[PDB]
Structure formats: C-alpha cells, structure tokens
Design a protein around this ligand. Structure first.
Ligand code: HEC
Ligand code: HEC
Lengths: 126, 126
C-alpha cells in the first residue's frame, strides 16, 4: 500500500485526521458540557482504538516527508517511546469507556491529549 | 466534528483513502499472487469493516463539496441504495475472512470492488 514515500505520507495523514475527529468529538462529554451516553462513547472509543494503531506502519524505513521531522528516524528509540506512550493511553481510554466510568474516561482522555502534543512538539513540523 | 461542510469533506476523503488502502492491499492475495495468511487477512478485513462505516455520516444535510456530485442529495434514496449495497458487500467480505475461505473471500472482494465503482460512476465527479 505505500509504493512511494508519498503514499505512506498520504495514508498516515488520513489516519491521523480521523483519529483527531474521533478523539476531539468527545471533548464536550469529558468536560461535562454534553450528557454522557456510555454506550455511544464505548462505540466511538472502539473506532478510535482501531484508528490509533494505523499511522505508525506508514512511518517505516525511507518515508520521510509531510510534516514529519527527520528525527523520527534519527532518534527512533525516542520516537517509539512517544508512540508507545500514546498507544498505552488509548488502552486506558478504552478501559474507562468499556467500564462506563466517566471520571476515569476524562482522566484517560487528558493523558491521551497530552501524549498527542508531546509527540507533536518533538516530531511534527510547525 | 463537521462544523462547516469542508470539515465533512475532509473527514470523508480521509476515511475513503484509508478504506482504499485496506481494500486494495488484498488484491495480490485474492488473485493468488501472494500467499493467503487467513489470520492476517481476518485482521485487515476487521480494520476495513470499521472504516467502511465511517464516510457516510459525513455526507449529511448541507455538506455538498469535494468530488461529491449533487445528485447524492437530490437522488438520496438512490444514493442510499448504492451505500447499502457496498456495506452489504462488506458484510460478505467479513463473513468469508472470518471463515478463512479464500474462494468466498475472492468472490466477496469482487462484489465489494464493483459496488465501489457503481457508486463512483453515479455520484463521484471526474
Ligand atoms: C507521534 C508518536 C504522534 C502521536 C502520538 C500523535 N501524532 Fe499527530 N502527527 C504526528 C506526525 C509526525 C504528524 C505529521 C505527519 C505527516 O507526515 O505529515 C502528525 C500529524 C497530525 C495531524 C495532521 C494530519 C494531516 O491532515 O496532515 C493531525 C490532525 C494529528 N496529527 C492529530 C493527532 C492526534 C489528535 C493525536 C492523539 C490522539 C496524535 N496526532 C498523536 C505524530 C504523532
Ligand atoms: C457511494 C455509495 C460510494 C461508495 C460505495 C464508495 N465510494 Fe469512494 N467516493 C465516493 C464519493 C462521493 C467520493 C468523493 C468524496 C468527496 O467529497 O470528495 C469518493 C471518493 C473516494 C476516494 C478519494 C478520496 C480522496 O482522497 O479525496 C477514494 C480513494 C475512494 N472513494 C475509494 C473508494 C473505495 C476503495 C470504495 C470501496 C471499497 C469506495 N470508495 C466506495 C462514494 C463512494
């Protein structure tokens, strides 16, 4: 599916756009500005869980480009920790959504949000 | 998540790009040009199943734009049949992948492929 480095860029950008939508639409619920519907959130966090695993296979060998910094590949043990933290947080998010526990959800939502930013600060271009 | 019609366009384009990748990467397997690994295909068709439900919520009221024809909304009972056929085919695809049955997979892959094209012929711009 990633014939040239550009195809990898196009895929990973599309997956990240969809995780942003699926993550970002839950903001009003975790802030108490919308009613919490536990089954709907459980379904939406299942979509997000699936989407959250996809970008990372499109950052393989030789796929520099986009708004990706080069340090993704020159500091790859570091990048990998910034991806694992984020996928670790998605596990948390799922555990709270599956339990129907809003306070835990709200907590795991903020862990997720911070890990998004920590990777962007270090490995995404302005 | 779709504040303006453009946000709906951007989301639906990203979801369709990812379904194309996840659908299109199985071509060599269904054509016998790559070995069939039933568990890996089962996992990939699970990703595709999840992705295949997403575009359609971003074609709601008042989200004309992109390479979407207007007839999506002026002939909406017709568009809806072209989406149901495609989602019906994804069910088939999943049933074969979950069974590990390559011939049925290959058949359901071609039903999927045709339904992609039938909708594009009728409701996507050149
Ligand atoms: C590294 C471990 C990252 C984590 C965790 C997250 N993102 Fe990110 N994101 C990353 C990179 C290197 C890039 C640029 C990709 C490129 O090749 O251009 C991005 C990009 C985005 C985008 C823009 C997509 C586009 O349309 O071009 C968005 C909307 C985005 N990222 C959102 C996002 C969110 C919401 C995350 C947590 C849920 C997140 N990213 C995590 C690197 C990393
Ligand atoms: C109608 C019922 C459709 C079915 C079934 C499929 N697609 Fe399609 N596709 C449709 C439209 C109306 C559009 C244009 C969207 C816009 O607003 O621009 C598309 C677009 C695509 C694209 C381009 C995405 C982009 O990057 O802009 C691709 C790669 C695509 N569609 C692929 C695709 C595949 C592989 C399908 C079956 C698995 C499929 N689409 C079904 C309408 C419909």
């Amino acid at each position: 599916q990633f014939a040239k480095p550009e195809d990898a860029v196009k895929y990973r950008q599309s997956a990240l756009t969809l995780m942003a939508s699926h993550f970002g639409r839950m903001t009003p619920v975790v802030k108490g500005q919308a009613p919490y519907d536990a089954a709907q959130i459980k379904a939406n966090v299942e979509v997000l869980k699936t989407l959250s695993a996809l970008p990372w296979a499109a950052f393989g060998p030789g796929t520099e480009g986009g708004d990706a910094r080069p340090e993704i590949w020159s500091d790859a043990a570091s990048f990998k920790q910034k991806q694992q933290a984020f996928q670790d947080n998605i596990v948390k998010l799922s555990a709270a959504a599956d339990a129907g526990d809003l306070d835990k959800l709200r907590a795991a939502f903020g862990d997720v949000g911070a890990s998004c930013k920590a990777c962007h600060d270090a490995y995404r271009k302005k």
